[PDB]
Design a protein around this nucleic acid. Sequence first.
DNA 1: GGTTGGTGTGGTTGG
Lengths: 249, 27
Amino acid sequence: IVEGSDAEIGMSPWQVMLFRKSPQELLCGASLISDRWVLTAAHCLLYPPWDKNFTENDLLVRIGKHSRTRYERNIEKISMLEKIYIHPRYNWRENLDRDIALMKLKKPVAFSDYIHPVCLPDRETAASLLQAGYKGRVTGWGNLKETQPSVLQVVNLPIVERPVCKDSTRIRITDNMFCAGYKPDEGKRGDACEGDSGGPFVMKSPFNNRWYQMGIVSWGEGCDRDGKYGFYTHVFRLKKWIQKVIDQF
Amino acid sequence: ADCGLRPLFEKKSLEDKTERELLESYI
DNA sequence: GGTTGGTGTGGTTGG
Ligand SMILES: *C[C@@](*)(O)[C@H](CCCNC(N)=[NH2+])NC(=O)[C@@H]1CCCN1C(=O)[C@H](N)Cc1ccccc1
Ligand SMILES: *[C@@H]1O[C@H](CO)[C@@H](O)[C@H](O)[C@H]1NC(C)=O
Ligand SMILES: [Cl-]
Ligand SMILES: [Cl-]
Ligand code: NA
Ligand code: NA
Ligand SMILES: [Zn+2]
Ligand SMILES: [Zn+2]
Ligand SMILES: [Zn+2]
């Protein structure tokens, strides 16, 4: 996260850290959507141009965390992966279309002050909240500048109109993506960055006061560049696939 | 269901330091 | 203690 700030304790209890065992390192962000399911970007698990192809046993999920590196005794829960499900139509060769994956945990995690799932949007929530100019919030332990934090970072950013998103890049944008960030002339700055993918773009519903995950940090070109915008997987667009996986498995 | 409500914030009727910026963006 | 025990030339881990 570039130009964000330290998150407050328990501010993003659905934040999950995808962790590589060997060597030990943070791979990506992710989110808790039930006591047994974690949502993330598929490129965090499969990306052949970077020789990336993780199997369940190469990974661990750490939930309830604040510090990037210290083991938070009795606060965080470390879970193993029973199964990974990548969207069948995830297009890594061209534009990361449908950059989304579900991970079923071996054992359900107990919720606590620091661990709780985020809501997934339904059609009314998506229609009402996903509008250009409305702000969502992005969290992550990714890089602080284009090329790092001691604790989880947070940044609020406005959803951008689709024509503007399209004209800001030569990468082919699809309806399974949306972009967010301040315009070349809005004064403010901020963006997600490498290391943040899988992390949630959330919005607080003014109708029922709950946080909803509308997006997943997916890609960008550099970080926080003037005129560029971060891109996010459109969670509601792929919700039928999310629900079919959860219902079935 | 039990999702999207934070024990240390909404449950205690406390706001985190910047959620207000989000709410204002709706208006 | 702490966002948490009982003890660290820490530990699955800083000070
Ligand atoms: C995997 C994630 O941590 C990362 C998130 C980047 C978010 N950036 C901004 N500014 N909000 N995603 C990536 O690094 C993805 C994975 C594939 C490469 N990529 C990019 O975002 C390249 N920078 C652009 C790109 C290359 C090929 C296909 C699509 C996008
Ligand atoms: C990824 O690796 C797993 C196990 O190594 C294998 O079953 C699968 O075929 C691979 N998928 C790829 C490289 O697309
Ligand atoms: Cl490999
Ligand atoms: Cl290899
Ligand atoms: Na920008
Ligand atoms: Na200690
Ligand atoms: Zn290899
Ligand atoms: Zn099973
Ligand atoms: Zn609860």
